[PDB]
Design a protein around this ligand. Structure first.
Ligand SMILES: Cc1ccncc1NC(=O)C(C)(C)c1cccc(Cl)c1
Ligand SMILES: Cc1ccncc1NC(=O)C(C)(C)c1cccc(Cl)c1
Lengths: 304, 304
C-alpha cells in the first residue's frame, strides 16, 4: 500500500499562526487562548544579535510596541513577558480557532510535523525528527522564525518545537514552547557547531519493518545477531546503541511481521557492512531514520 | 537553509472532507458548495468490483441510500448523479468551510499534495508527483478512496486528484475531479499493469539547482553537453527527453545560480553514467524527481 514521509494534517495549527512585529523585525507567533508565543529575538535588530542582553532590550519595549496581526485583524496586546527564549504576549481576545493543545518537550529520535510560515502565513508542511544532537534538518528561510513543530493525537495538538535559528552548517535549532532550546544552542549570532549526529537505530529498524510490510524484502537474510554484537556494528557506523527499551517498542512490528527484532538487526548489520549494492528500500537508497515505530504502526494501520 | 519534500498546508482541504457510506461500503467524499464528490465504486460490494455495471448498480440506489457525514453532522442528500468515475451528491447545505477552488487536470511530472483520509477524517499529508505513466506512489490503505490531491495558489485550492485504486504492484491510480482516470486505468478489479515509469528529467535538474542553492555542489563539473547529446544519455537511463520548453522553465534557476542549463545537464549526465560514488545530494542517495522548477523557486523564496 506504500510508505511516505507523512506529516500530520496542519489545519489546527494554521488557525494559530499570527505575524508578530517589533520595530523593524517581523516573525511568526503562535496564538493559543489569549497568549501569543514567539521567539524573543523579535525585539532584536541584526546589530543586537551579535551579543544581545534580552532583559535590557525588552525593558525599552511596551505592550504597544508588539504588533500582532492574525490574518488581517490586529490583536490588542495587554501584557508581555519573557519565559526563557520565548516572549508571551497577552492579548485581549482568545483565539476562537484554538485547538485542544499541550506543550511537550520531545526526546531526540522522536518525530514531528513542521508548519513553515512567513509573515504569519503558512507555506508548507513536512515531517522532521529531533536529531540525537538536538538539531533538525528542516527548510527555513529568514522570516520563518516562530514556525512550530507538533504532533496530533485524535483532536489534541502537542506543540514541541518553535524555530529560532539556522546554524552556519545549514541545520536548524529551536526551543520547546516554554522557550528552552533543544541542545546547547543560545539565541546569539555566534559560532555554534552541532555535535556528532548519529543515526536513530530504532527508527531505521522500524522503517525496515515498514519495508517488509509493503513488499520490500530483498534485505532479509538467514542470520541473527545479539544486542552486544549489533551494537559493536552500530558504534562503528555512528548509529545509536540499541537497548532492550528499543527492542520492546519494536514488539508490535515484530509481532505483525513474524520477524524477531534481533533477526531484523542482522539484516541492518549486513546493510551497514555491505551497503545497498545499488538497490533501494521504499524508494530510498539510504537507510531512513526519521520514522519512529509509532509512525510506522500509525501509517500502516490508518489512524486518523 | 535546507530542502524538504514539502506539502501545502492542508487546512482548506480538511474542512471539505466527509464520510460517504452506501450500503456496506464507506469511503471519503469532498464537500464543496452543495455537492459531495466521491469515487463511484462506493455503490459496489467487493463482489461487484470484478466486473461492475455502474449504471445498473446506481439504478438500484436512491438519494436516501447515500449517507454523508461531515464530522458528526448528517448531510441531507437531494440529488445524485454519476460523472465519469465519480458520483456527485447534491446536498441541501453548502459547506461553510468551502475554500476558493478549481478543478484541474494536471500533467504528468507535475506535483501535488495528498491529504490521506479514512472515514472522512484526515490522517496525514504528503507531496506526490503524477508519474509519466499516470500512477502515483502514495500511501493508501482500504478506506482511503476519495482522498484528494491538490495545489494551492494564495487562497485558491486547485483539486487535481481523487484516489480510487491500488494496482497489484502497490502503486496508485485515480481520477481528476470530473471522474476521468489519469492513464488507462478502469475502476474494476482486473489486472492493470502500469506501463514503464520514466524519471522526470526537468524535475531532477530543478532539484540539482536546489542542491546548489543550499550548498551541495560536489556534483558540479567542468563539462557541458547539448540537448541531443544529453537525450541520448536520458534514453539509456529511462529519463524523459529534455526539450527547449524544459530548458525555458529552468531559466529562473539558471539565472539565480549562474549555472547554464546545459552545464547542469552535463552534471546529470555524469551522475547517470558514474552514479553518486557513495555520496548524497540534499540528504538523498538517488536522483530526486518529485520537485518541479516551480516547487524549487517557491520553497527557496518563501512563497506563502
Ligand atoms: C536566516 C534564518 C534562516 C533560517 N532560520 C532562521 C534564520 N534566522 C536566524 O538564524 C537569525 C534570526 C539570523 C538568528 C541568528 C542568531 C541567533 C538566532 Cl536565535 C537567530
Ligand atoms: C485496498 C485499497 C488500498 C489502497 N487504495 C485503494 C484500495 N482499494 C481498491 O483498490 C479497491 C476498492 C479494492 C478497488 C479495486 C478495483 C478497482 C478500484 Cl477503482 C478499487
Amino acid at each position: 500500500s506504500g510508505f511516505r514521509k507523512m506529516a500530520f494534517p496542519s489545519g489546527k495549527v494554521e488557525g494559530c499562526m499570527v505575524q508578530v512585529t517589533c520595530g523593524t523585525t517581523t516573525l511568526n507567533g503562535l496564538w493559543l487562548d489569549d497568549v501569543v508565543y514567539c521567539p524573543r529575538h523579535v525585539i532584536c535588530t541584526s546589530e543586537d544579535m551579535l551579543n544581545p542582553n534580552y532583559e535590557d532590550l525588552l525593558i525599552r519595549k511596551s505592550n504597544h510596541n508588539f504588533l500582532v496581526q492574525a490574518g488581517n485583524v490586529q490583536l490588542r496586546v495587554i501584557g508581555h513577558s519573557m519565559q526563557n527564549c520565548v516572549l508571551k504576549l497577552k492579548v485581549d481576545t482568545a483565539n476562537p480557532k484554538t485547538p485542544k493543545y499541550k506543550f511537550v518537550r520531545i526526546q531526540p529520535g522522536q518525530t514531528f510535523s513542521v508548519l513553515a510560515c512567513y509573515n504569519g502565513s503558512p507555506s508548507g508542511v513536512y515531517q522532521c525528527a529531533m536529531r540525537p544532537n538536538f538539531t533538525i534538518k528542516g527548510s527555513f528561510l529568514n522570516g520563518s522564525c516562530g514556525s512550530v513543530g507538533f504532533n496530533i493525537d485524535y483532536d489534541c495538538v502537542s506543540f514541541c518545537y518553535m524555530h529560532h535559528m539556522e546554524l552556519p552548517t545549514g541545520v536548524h535549532a529551536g526551543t520547546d514552547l516554554e522557550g528552552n532550546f533543544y541542545g546547547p544552542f543560545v539565541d546569539r549570532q555566534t559560532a555554534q557547531a552541532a555535535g556528532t549526529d548519529t543515526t536513530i537505530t530504532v527508527n531505521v529498524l522500524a522503517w525496515l519493518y515498514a519495508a517488509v510490510i509493503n513488499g520490500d524484502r530483498w534485505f532479509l537474510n538467514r542470520f541473527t545477531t545479539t544486542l552486544n554484537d549489533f551494537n559493536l556494528v552500530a558504534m562503528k557506523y555512528n548509529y545509536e546503541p540499541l537497548t532492550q527499551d528499543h527492542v520492546d517498542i519494536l514488539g508490535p512490528l515484530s509481532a505483525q511481521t513474524g520477524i524477531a527484532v534481533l533477526d531484523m538487526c542482522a539484516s541492518l548489520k549486513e546493510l551497514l557492512q555491505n551497503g545497498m549494492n545499488g538497490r533501494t528500500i521504499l524508494g530510498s537508497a539510504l537507510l531512513e531514520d526519521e520514522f519512529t515505530p509509532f509512525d510506522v504502526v500509525r501509517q500502516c494501520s490508518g489512524v486518523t
